[PDB]
């Protein structure tokens, strides 16, 4: 029903400017306050500002005065967030949220903004299969190695999300303009190779979508 769509991911250069969008569905933005929230990598949430889309009032946190500018378009149901003169510190996940007067009831999935001069590099996806039954149980442990991609993020999935039980996705580690990430799924010895176990990888910043059957 109600959903706040965000741009998802973008690689921007130090010193430039960027404009992020937040498209609302199911409800009118003129009726609510829309907020913009930031969260740096291993860090806390930070409040950026709000806007009353009805008759355009905006309040920011002094920290972002003349750095952040919020706009909204009642006819396209979209809130906007432009940042300027980007530096490393602006690398974060920016979320938009709906204020119902009591609390933030709907959030967007966020947009990872990476301020850097490295280029976009799509991931190599490699399957991890056992050299005989992974006997550290009567459950076979399989996997996928997603390496050398930039920027973040990637969303790995198994059997299109049908396999969520026994899944372990290990966060990415950066090593020179490149990240490596892995995932493991542990299934019963009765379902493989008999049933198809496939891992789906998607890298938004390069429009790459790969499916590896193991």
């Amino acid at each position: 029903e109600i959903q706040l769509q965000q741009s998802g991911a973008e690689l921007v250069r130090p010193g430039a400017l960027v404009k992020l969008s937040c498209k609302a569905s199911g409800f009118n933005i003129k009726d609510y306050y829309m907020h913009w929230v930031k969260q740096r990598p291993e860090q806390g949430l930070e409040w950026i500002g709000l806007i009353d889309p009805e008759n355009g009032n905006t309040i920011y946190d002094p920290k972002f005065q003349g750095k952040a500018s919020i706009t909204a378009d009642t006819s396209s149901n979209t809130a906007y967030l432009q940042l300027s003169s980007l530096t490393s510190e602006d690398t974060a996940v920016y979320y938009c949220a709906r204020d119902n007067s009591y609390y933030f009831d709907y959030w967007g999935q966020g947009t990872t903004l990476t301020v850097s001069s490295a280029k976009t590099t799509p991931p190599s996806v490699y399957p991890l299969a056992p050299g005989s039954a992974a006997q550290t149980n009567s459950m076979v442990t399989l996997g996928c190695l997603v390496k050398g991609y930039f920027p973040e993020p990637v969303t790995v999935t198994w059997n299109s999300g049908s396999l969520s039980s026994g899944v372990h996705t290990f966060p990415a580690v950066l090593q020179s303009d490149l990240y490596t990430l892995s995932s493991s799924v542990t299934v019963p010895s009765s379902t493989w190779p008999s049933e198809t176990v496939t891992c789906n990888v998607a890298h938004p910043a390069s429009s790459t979508k790969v499916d590896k059957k193991i």
Partner: protein, 214 residues
């Protein structure tokens, strides 16, 4: 303008234990304080609003109280999936301010990891690279150490280690260790072993394989 202090920063508690998180403001915020829960890499979820009211679909084991500048959230009987980061948010004055957050980890009975080791996949060898991956799953406590040995106590450098966050279901942790090499260097060595030391046993777990790939 209004500074929020959250305490503690991080805490450990056992299942069925009662927990209390604190938030104090620099000035009376007139009960305009909310609590949010953030599960790793998911947008925040509201637990409590206006100091004591329970938000959408939150269990009754959660409660809140406080007035003036002192506030607290309390979880009566800890459930495994209360692992998350909790934040308080004051909205009594503009700009709205988040406390620094407190991370909650479930203390649990030690568990030994199940180890798996995968040699370089064919797909990758075909491109000049050789990655060797080692999975250490469902162990507790998080404290663990892995070493890679190539042809003897001759251990190496060029490894990427990553830990998941704590499991919401069974409260364990998992780790991925990847030794990355060139096809070239891989084919000059015989045995690859990754050893792990974890207090659940005085003996190290030596998981091995001989390339002897013909």
């Amino acid at each position: 303008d209004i500074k929020m202090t959250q305490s503690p920063s991080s805490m450990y508690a056992s299942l069925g234990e009662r927990v209390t998180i604190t938030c104090k403001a620099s000035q009376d915020i007139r009960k305009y304080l909310n609590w949010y829960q953030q599960k790793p890499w998911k947008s925040p979820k509201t637990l409590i609003y206006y100091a004591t009211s329970l938000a959408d679909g939150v269990p009754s084991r959660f409660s809140g109280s406080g007035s003036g500048q002192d506030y607290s959230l309390t979880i009566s009987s800890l459930e495994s999936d209360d692992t998350a980061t909790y934040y308080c948010l004051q909205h009594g004055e503009s700009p709205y301010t988040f406390g620094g957050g407190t991370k909650l980890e479930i203390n649990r009975a030690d568990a030994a990891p199940t180890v798996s080791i995968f040699p370089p996949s064919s797909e990758q060898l075909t491109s000049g690279g050789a990655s060797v991956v080692c999975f250490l799953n469902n162990f507790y406590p998080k404290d663990i150490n892995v070493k890679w040995k190539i042809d003897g106590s001759e251990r190496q450098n060029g490894v990427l280690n990553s830990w998941t966050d704590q499991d919401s279901k069974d409260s364990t942790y998992s780790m991925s260790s990847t030794l990355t090499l060139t096809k070239d260097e891989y084919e000059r060595h015989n045995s690859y072993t990754c050893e792990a030391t974890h207090k659940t046993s005085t003996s190290p777990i030596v998981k091995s394989f001989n390339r002897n790939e013909c």
